[PDB]
Design an enzyme around this catalytic site. Structure first.
Site, PDB file in Angstrom:
ATOM      1  N   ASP A 155     -35.833 -12.668  23.629  1.00 34.19           N
ATOM      2  CA  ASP A 155     -35.120 -13.943  23.744  1.00 34.19           C
ATOM      3  C   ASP A 155     -33.669 -13.696  24.118  1.00 34.19           C
ATOM      4  OD1 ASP A 155     -34.693 -16.744  23.809  1.00 34.19           O
ATOM      5  OD2 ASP A 155     -34.675 -16.956  21.640  1.00 34.19           O
ATOM      6  N   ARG A 159     -27.024 -17.980  24.489  1.00 33.94           N
ATOM      7  CA  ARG A 159     -27.022 -18.526  23.125  1.00 33.94           C
ATOM      8  C   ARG A 159     -27.287 -17.458  22.074  1.00 33.94           C
ATOM      9  NH1 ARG A 159     -31.602 -20.337  25.783  1.00 33.94           N
ATOM     10  NH2 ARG A 159     -33.316 -18.959  25.149  1.00 33.94           N
ATOM     11  N   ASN A 160     -27.836 -16.299  22.465  1.00 33.82           N
ATOM     12  CA  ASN A 160     -28.106 -15.210  21.519  1.00 33.82           C
ATOM     13  C   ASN A 160     -27.168 -14.021  21.704  1.00 33.82           C
ATOM     14  OD1 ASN A 160     -30.157 -16.499  20.034  1.00 33.82           O
ATOM     15  ND2 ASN A 160     -31.757 -15.791  21.467  1.00 33.82           N
TER      16      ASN A 160
END
Ligand SMILES: Cn1cc(-c2cc3c(N4CCN(c5ncccn5)CC4)ncnn3c2)cn1
Length: 293
Positions: A155, A159-160
């Site tokens: 992922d 955003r990570n």
């Protein structure tokens, strides 16, 4: 049979990590899922006996089913196996009795890079391009480190990536990270919501995840970075037309602020043939060359 790959998730939990939960004071919620939430917290005496420090704490909700409880322990064991790196949100401790499992990680005071770029977008000047090249380099270094440990993240997205003091970026959220061990890939058996616009086509169409599919997502990350936080594939909902276009070779164009050599990396990360994508090792060396020039 006399030699095997050591599955880090089969290894005993190392109680060197154990920390008393009564020395944590929970604060703001930083994120939430079906497992539970991540909160900001103060840890009294975690590193130095007489000092408090700010951490992040990932917690199972009391109602967590077996699928989510063992997933959090597996994540703890993967982080324990990976060890420390400057460009990941590092494990600091865990609480494995007295309540639901808690995993304690570093706290990154500037939050996620996606919101950061969107905040700073209005006052960006070619926040500068030097910052963007640094973030691209640091994330490639983090991922090269993961790949060197036979692990995939699954992922990777702006955003990570979190930002902390010193303009250091850290990869976060290892809930889906896997040691691919002997199989050289991972076929996902879950049925969860998936980050479709960041996924390689072979992951969408055949549920296969590899070193090369992490590299595809890194390419999408680069496009997010150099567009100053735009959502990928603007004006294209995820639907039948989206999958057909990706399958047929549609790719995003160069972002406004991307140097030509950085879009070049993006294009190679998005090769339909996984074997033709660069490795993170190769990407690090490429961006290193760009920085020094
Ligand atoms: C507005 N603001 C937010 C922060 C912030 C957020 C984190 C953070 N995480 C890890 C991943 N999270 C997660 N969420 C849902 C499911 C799984 N994981 C939530 C975020 N980890 C460490 N520091 N840190 C600092 C600072 N300012």
């Amino acid at each position: 049979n006399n030699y095997s790959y050591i599955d880090p998730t089969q290894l005993p939990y190392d109680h060197k990590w154990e920390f008393p939960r009564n020395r944590l004071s929970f604060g703001k919620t930083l994120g939430a899922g079906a497992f539970g939430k991540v909160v900001e917290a103060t840890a009294q005496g975690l590193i130095k006996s007489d000092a408090a420090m700010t951490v992040a704490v990932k917690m199972l909700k009391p109602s967590a089913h077996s699928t989510e409880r063992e997933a959090l322990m597996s994540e703890l064991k993967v982080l324990s196996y990976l060890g420390n790196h400057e460009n990941i949100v590092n494990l600091l401790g865990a609480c494995t009795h007295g309540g639901p499992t808690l995993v304690i990680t570093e706290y990154c005071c500037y939050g996620d890079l996606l919101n950061f770029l969107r905040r700073k977008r209005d006052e960006f000047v070619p926040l500068t391009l030097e910052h963007l090249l640094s973030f691209s380099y640091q994330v490639a270094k983090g991922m090269a480190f993961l790949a060197s440990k036979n692990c995939i993240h699954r992922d990777l997205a702006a955003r990570n990536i979190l930002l902390t003091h010193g303009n250091i970026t850290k990869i976060c959220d290892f809930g889906l990270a896997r040691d691919i061990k002997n199989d050289s890939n991972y076929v996902d058996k879950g049925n969860a919501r998936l980050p479709v616009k960041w996924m390689a086509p072979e992951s969408i169409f055949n549920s296969v995840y590899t070193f090369e599919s992490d590299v595809w997502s890194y390419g999408i990350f680069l496009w997010e970075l150099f567009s100053l936080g735009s959502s990928p594939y603007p004006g294209m909902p995820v639907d039948s037309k989206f999958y057909k276009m990706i399958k047929e070779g549609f790719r995003m164009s160069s972002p406004e602020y991307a140097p030509a050599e950085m879009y070049d990396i993006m294009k190679t990360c998005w090769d339909a043939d996984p074997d033709k994508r660069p490795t993170f090792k190769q990407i690090v060396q490429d961006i290193e060359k760009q920085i020094s020039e």
